[PDB]
Design a protein around this ligand. Structure first.
Ligand SMILES: [Zn+2]
Ligand SMILES: [Zn+2]
Lengths: 46, 58, 138, 50, 99, 66, 107, 115, 58
């Protein structure tokens, strides 16, 4: 129900909800990647 | 890129395509094999008359 | 494994004949990564660009087809596939040229074929602008 | 199949079907199958000495 | 027909009197028309490795499956679910942790 | 990246021979004897192990991890 | 849905006919040509893939006398089928004999 | 020699099928029997000749450009003879009389003899 | 501007649309004095042309 971002360097969940400048909670590293989606995808094995 | 050299002498045209070529001897010498993903885009306006109404309905 | 022979006449001027089974087992398989970036700048007025969520269909409680791949924060998600004319970052800007009015300027995926979003990077500069980079894959 | 590091996870679901080798090379049952004609090296004149 | 050698996963046998245009047919049927079972649909939940999803599905396609394919039928056009008769199903689930 | 499952040319399953190939190159075989002892007669199978670079052992040092 | 279509020649009544075989390739074409050319009433027999994108062969059969070319085509199919039956029987007998001889030795 | 569209002798070079010049058999078919027969003949040849060639087999290897013994003797003799005559021409220019060719200096005569 | 109506170049009157590599070598190795065919392989080579508009001929 919230959005959860993975930190770039230290691999922690950060949960950026407030309108903040982007910042890791534990480190000072300033790059976030989204998590992988929960829905399923179908690939052909070709 | 002025009017004369840019637009009067040689001007860009539509109803055209551009693809990499590859050989195929099984065609006659007066045939070219157009891909499907180009022939769905390039169109020819065929006026409806008595000879081809049943073709153009399909 | 290259044979040097003349085969079937489809190899006339420098052309070369491949093997279908070699192509199926993995020969020459290649990945293409592209980029799609969007910036969310803060203006001289105290007004900011914003990312709306997925505009749902109220009739079926599913998002519309042009917004199908979005997450709940308007930014597309890793793992899902994109087709032609879908949105990736649902940007909206102020038309200040009293309340701010927003027009939609989404960042759509122009492309011939389907892609896979691999990672979505979200970071900022010091000027409060947000940089969002996707990494597409075919 | 793949190779991992801690934190990474694979959780997928595969559907095997029946297929012939003409369609795709993953259905072919043989590693390779060939044939060669059985030779007969024959001698014209007798080979003696070194 | 004289079988000169045989073990697991291999065979070697002589044929006398057949012609090239029939022995070539036996070779081509062995390469391209004897059906087997192989993965086609890879339904992915949470792939977070470095091996990309496309390449992983392609590697899973090439793995031989020991089903005896005289017992199964061809899946029809479409029919993404499948039934008891015309499919198998394999489930892979690996999570990596520190020792 | 990682070893291919099947040889590109013939079709023999080569993707299980890799961990045995490095194990036989820890015990100081030559490559010419190791590829024979693994049982790759055709040279199309032999180039799958003789020419393969194992990038994923060195790409996994750069993956993010807890 | 029909996989066999018979295109006759322009001026000749049924003794020079071209068999279009859908959903085949060189596999059946070469073996069937081999079993047709053994029939001594066939003057000409040979196939061709129309285009490699398509799975067709055109198997032209031209007979000598007055018999129509459907009969050498049918005799070629039946003779190829009986060859495959005999090969299957002899091969299964040889496999059973090999397994029996190996399981009888070193016991 | 083609007579009544039956090849009676001789093989088809470039000079009989290729795009070089006249006496092309397709040019004969163009001038005597219309465009349609020339185009049908070119289509039939382009259809037929690979079907023969890909079942003949036609290949080139390092054994096809390797030199035999009869070349490796003659090349050594030719290089020794040519380098001797070049050395005698160099010596005839620098420290003696060199027979000057008409219309040029002596060094251009040396260049012409060495070439 | 058809292919069949422009078989000869306007420069000197020599043809341009003609055979090229692997069609010359095929016809040269077909028309040596050495080659001979049985009835099977001769029928197999001749039958490659029976396609297209030459499908109806004897
Ligand atoms: Zn951090
Ligand atoms: Zn191999």
């Amino acid at each position: 129900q919230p959005m959860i971002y993975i930190c770039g360097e230290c691999h922690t969940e950060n949960e950026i909800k407030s309108r903040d400048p982007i910042r890791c909670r534990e480190c000072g590293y300033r790059i976030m990647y989204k998590k992988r989606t929960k829905r399923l995808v179908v690939f052909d094995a070709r | 890129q002025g009017r004369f050299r840019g637009n009067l002498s040689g001007k860009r045209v539509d109803f055209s395509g551009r693809t990499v070529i590859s050989p195929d001897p099984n065609l006659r010498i007066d045939e070219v094999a157009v891909p499907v993903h180009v022939a769905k885009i390039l169109t020819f306006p065929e006026k409806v008359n008595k000879a081809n109404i049943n073709f153009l309905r399909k | 494994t290259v044979a040097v022979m003349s085969y079937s006449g489809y190899d006339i001027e420098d052309a070369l004949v491949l093997n279908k089974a070699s192509l199926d087992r993995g020969f020459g398989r290649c990945l293409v990564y592209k980029n799609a970036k969007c910036t969310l700048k803060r203006y001289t007025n105290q007004t900011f660009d914003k990312v709306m969520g997925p505009m749902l269909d109220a009739a079926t409680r599913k998002p519309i087809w042009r917004h199908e791949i979005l997450d709940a924060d308007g930014i597309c998600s890793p793992g899902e596939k994109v087709e032609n004319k879908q949105v990736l970052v649902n940007k909206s800007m102020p038309t200040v040229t009293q309340q701010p009015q927003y027009k939609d300027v989404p960042i759509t995926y122009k492309g011939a074929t389907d892609s896979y979003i691999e990672k979505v990077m979200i970071s900022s500069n010091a000027e409060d602008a947000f940089l969002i980079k996707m990494l597409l894959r075919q | 199949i793949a190779q991992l590091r801690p934190g990474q996870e694979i959780d997928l679901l595969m559907h095997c079907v029946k297929g012939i080798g003409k369609d795709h090379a993953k259905f072919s049952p043989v590693a390779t199958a060939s044939y060669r004609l059985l030779p007969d090296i024959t001698l014209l004149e007798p080979v003696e000495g070194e | 027909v004289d079988v000169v050698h045989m073990d697991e996963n291999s065979l070697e046998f002589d044929m006398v009197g057949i012609d090239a245009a029939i022995a070539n047919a036996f070779r081509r049927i062995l390469l391209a028309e004897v059906p087997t079972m192989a993965v086609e649909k890879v339904l992915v939940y949470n792939n977070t490795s470095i091996v990309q999803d496309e390449i992983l599905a392609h590697r899973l396609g090439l793995i031989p499956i020991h089903a005896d394919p005289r017992l199964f039928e061809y899946r029809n056009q479409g029919d993404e679910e499948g039934t008891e008769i015309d499919t198998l199903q394999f489930r892979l689930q690996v999570r990596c942790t520190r020792n | 990246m990682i070893i291919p499952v099947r040889c590109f040319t013939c079709g023999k399953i080569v993707g299980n021979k890799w961990e045995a190939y490095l194990g036989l190159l820890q015990a100081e075989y030559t490559e010419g004897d190791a590829l024979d002892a693994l049982g790759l007669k055709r040279y199309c199978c032999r180039r799958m192990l003789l020419a393969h670079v194992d990038l994923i052992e060195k790409l996994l040092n750069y993956a993010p991890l807890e | 849905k029909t996989a066999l279509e018979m295109v006759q020649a322009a001026g000749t009544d049924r003794h020079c006919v071209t068999f279009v075989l859908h959903e085949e390739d060189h596999t059946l074409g070469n073996s069937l040509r081999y079993m047709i050319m053994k029939n001594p009433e066939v003057e000409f027999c040979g196939y061709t893939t129309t285009h490699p994108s398509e799975s067709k062969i055109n198997l032209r059969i031209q007979t000598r006398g007055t018999l129509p070319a459907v009969e050498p085509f049918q005799r070629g199919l039946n003779e190829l089928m009986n060859v495959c039956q005999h090969v299957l029987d002899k091969f299964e007998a040889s496999i059973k004999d090999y397994k029996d001889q190996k399981a009888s030795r070193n016991e | 020699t083609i007579q009544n569209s039956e090849l009676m002798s001789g093989s088809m070079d470039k000079g009989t099928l290729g795009s070089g010049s006249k006496n092309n058999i397709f040019y004969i078919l163009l001038r005597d029997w219309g465009q349609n027969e020339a185009a049908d003949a070119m289509s039939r040849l382009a259809r037929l000749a690979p079907v023969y060639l890909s079942n003949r087999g036609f290949s080139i290897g390092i054994g096809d450009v390797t030199p035999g013994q009869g070349l490796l003797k003659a090349k050594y003799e030719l290089l020794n003879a040519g380098y001797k005559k070049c050395d005698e021409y160099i010596e005839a220019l620098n420290t003696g009389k060199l027979q000057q060719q008409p219309g040029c200096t002596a060094e251009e005569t040396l260049e012409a003899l060495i070439l | 501007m058809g292919t069949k109506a422009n078989l000869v170049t306007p420069r000197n009157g020599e043809p341009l649309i003609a055979a090229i590599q692997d069609f010359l070598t095929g016809a040269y190795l077909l028309t040596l004095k050495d080659t001979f065919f049985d009835r099977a392989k001769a029928c197999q080579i001749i039958a490659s042309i029976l396609v297209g508009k030459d499908e109806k001929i004897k």
